[model samples]
Target: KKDELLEAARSGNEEKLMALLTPLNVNCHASDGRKSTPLHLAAGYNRVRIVQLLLQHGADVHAKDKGGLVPLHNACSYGHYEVTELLLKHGACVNAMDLWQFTPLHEAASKNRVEVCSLLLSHGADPTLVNCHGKSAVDMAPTPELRERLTYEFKGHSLLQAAREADLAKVKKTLALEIINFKQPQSHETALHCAVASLHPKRKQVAELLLRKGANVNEKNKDFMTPLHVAAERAHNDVMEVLHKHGAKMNALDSLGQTALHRAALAGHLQTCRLLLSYGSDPSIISLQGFTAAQMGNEAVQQILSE
Candidate 1:
């Protein structure tokens, strides 16, 4: 039963595990292997549902394997948010020190799991915690890129600053977002708006990160232009696809009551018009100016719209 329980967890078979797990075996340990608890395997495997199941059965969050690391270490080392979040939410220690005095933060930072580190930081992670080798979480980052990225994160960088600068690493490589929706105070432009409007080298990737962090796709700036509107008007084609796949509303209007396709055509951005059309932007729709996109378009755009 214990073998079945741990194997079920390791393999991520939710149905099979449910059939095999109960309170009796939920906390059961591996007999002679790593002495891992069922929670350990599930957390390491990133089985969110199975972790939830084990927790519901009153599984021990603190259960240590031969590694002396708690399930928090497993989740952090494996680079997943959902499992780490579940364990932390269920009262797992934030700074669980493992063998060699490695904390969960050490594992996440070393793995360059910036997202995992962010979740830990939001949940009271202690950056000062050190390991047996006298290394702190900052010291554990595998590269100077990640090392500095980790430094800024621990020191706190605002989401909008990174979004405007098109710094993809600093955007949370990028959730936890008191500021993901932050607007430029006067312009009222959300981070998504800045991300779209910026011409920085990594603008597209930065915008995608903001979206992944749950930046509102249809959030309007003071101009009432949504990110999609900005993407269309600017011909940011790669970013347009990202927004589209993230459920961007192609037909949503700006303050001028023009669809993004109308904005594209009027800007003479023929490809932008085509991308918007393929994304289901309504071609026959009239703008606030009482003109269809083709009528509003330049010669090239007008021809494409004719197609």
Candidate 2:
């Protein structure tokens, strides 16, 4: 009878379970070697009807296996919404944290199961439930690749957090290394390129730190685009101004033969144009294709010639 019941429960045989439970007159609530009853196996495999029948036959809902895998925990981990609904409807504690202190909600969120997460939330599963690691499900979420459902607007330090928030102490410690070889274009461009191109504030810190360590403001990128050229292309007025004041070459031509003034004219940044012109930018210097800053500018930009 025990072997028959175990086979039925393991194989999810609803008919066999019913047949054995009816005439045997034995305990339908028999436990395995791990102390887990048939309810636990049914819930683990997401067998909704079996779980209902076991519960109806007075199977213990709160019983734990050898490894402390409760029915609710297994259901939640496997995203068994129907079986989970059955268990919870019959007074399953949604807030029940396991031996590892991981609530069902935490497990669901960690697995990135949106429907399961929603079900848990609707059933009053606390999203604030922190695991044993002093982190919430939002924090214990497996990895960056695993947390696809998580949004940028999470409660604590979320995605882009490492880039958004910078530690100045780390900068200071790195700068103390005293490796000051700025001869190569890549090394020299590290600060200036990042300063103009990076929208995040921490990138600006990296640029500033590099600058403090004597990174050339006039350094060009791989394509020979100076900090000024990069800033003008990105329409970053403040970064442009800072780089310009720090001796960035306003007329540095890129591999495409475009200058800061040329890009500014194309983008219609009149202030950048005026600044470049005031800084001795030669509008007459044609590109490899014979396109000058004047040729790139619009009607309003052409009027700047008179200025």
Candidate 3:
């Protein structure tokens, strides 16, 4: 009866399986072979109706075959999205390890089943789990190339991203790292740049916290613009004061030879010009375009710079 039940599951014979099923027999096992149960076959073949019928009658979602492979392992390994979701919906453990320590995530990724992999991840499958072979699902991923530049930066830090969002609690928590001076992997913008470049309600407050936690004030980015140069161009008096209090250089030049004063002057930022001037930014300094702050200024900025 159990063998017939397992065979019916494998044959996609939902009607025969339905007729043979008693409440207790819904969980019937394959007495021979890998000792696969009816649920295992239904899951392995992605027999959605059969799986539904069995589960409705009380098949175990966690039942393992002789290899200790759970129903989810087969569903994922076969790239069966429908049954995978069904298994997950029924409370299958996304990270259940077979005897070989391979989780459903490992199985899905091994087949390069991108959709199934995504489903597994959404269900909390840990891609970091290593099999008995010491290979993580990421390690076994068949993408072969093109796997580097991503969350590779994530490997460096989330602090820069966190600060940009003015995530106050995360900002302080990430600030406790031994490496406070970490820069964005590509942009070279530091935590201070992220904190001051944004307009979130708490961005200025985040800027203040970063500086007090040893964030660099004059840190240069890919364009060689320091945080103060950034503040000047953005006409942000709030961040300017924080940068100035942190000892940011007033006359720092970016790649364009433009100083904080030059950026403010060119932008016609009257208040920013005044703020930079108060911090002693050099109005006399010129840009690569050979324009001094007064020369670069609009009439309004010229009015302030001339003084």
Candidate 4:
């Protein structure tokens, strides 16, 4: 009977689950291998009717699975927009965090479900709520695009608020109140990281906006890696050019004691290697691997090394 119930829920057999509930007098309670309740399966599969049915039958919506994720959190994490809406309507808390401190908003942002995010936001999911690392859902967003979207309204008129992220008009039109309280990391990154990590046509626009607004081009991260290191490591040649033109230090090293040149060589990124060399990166320094950039030289870098 338990096996039949588990399979029925997992397959979203709403009719079978419903039939099993009445005259049989069976408890709505059921667990998968992980002890997830019937609500968990219905929520995970976006079986909205089944979810409401299970809830009406006194199923515990807040029942924690082995992973400690509630049914509501699972639905949001899997991007079941309608299911999430249903769960929230049934008094499910969107702000509920699992054992990992991940809220529904965090899951929604990570999954790039803009509609689910909007739903969560409308339900008062605080974008400002930080997780264990103290990073807000906006900060933990998967991409610059996602971060900018999540934070657009949250950020007031700060000039550099999303500048390095290419929110050009926002960067160009910031106020003192907007700029002063807008804090971002100096090193591991912010708008600056976004600019160097991608090469969209507007990347230069983003960088130029920050430089004009007084963004530090050479701020190091916790590892002492600057935006230039990120550019080189990702082999974004044009972004490297933009950062260099704006005073990014070519010879900067992270706490690991490696430079942008070291990262380029290790990744065998020839274009970035050439671009960094062109900006006067010294080829002499060895990484912890005891290999100088010149030692790992390919045809392009070897020619640059000889020069």
Strongest candidate by TM-score: 3
lDDT of 1 at 190: 89
RMSD values for the candidates in order, in angstroms, are: 14.5, 13.3, 9.5, 16.0
Q: Model 2, range 108-186, lDDT digits (tens) per residue?
A: 7777766776677667666666777777766756767435344322312222333355766544543453444244444
TM-score of candidate 2 on Cα atoms, chains taken together: 0.44
Give the alpha carbon lDDT tens digit for every residue of 7-124 in model 1.
9999899988989887677888899988999889989989889999889889999999997989999999989799998999899999888778999999999888989988887777
| lDDT at 25, model 2 | 34
- Weakest 10 consecutive residues, lDDT, candidate 2? 151-160
TM-score (all chains, Cα) for each model: 0.51, 0.44, 0.60, 0.48
Q: How accurate is candidate 3 locally (lDDT)?
A: 0.82
User: Positional deviation of 21 in candidate 2, in angstroms?
Assistant: 2.6
Residue 34, candidate 1: C-alpha displacement in angstroms:
1.3
lDDT (Cα, 0-100) at 157 in candidate 2: 28
Error of 3 at 41 (Å): 0.7
- Best prediction by lDDT: 1
lDDT, model 2:
0.72
Name the weakest run of 10 consecutive residues (lDDT summed) in model 1: 170-179
Candidate 4 lDDT over 116-182, as tens digits, reads 8877877778788888888778877788987876666344323344666787766655443445224
Task: Arrange candidates by TM-score, descending.
Answer: 3, 1, 4, 2
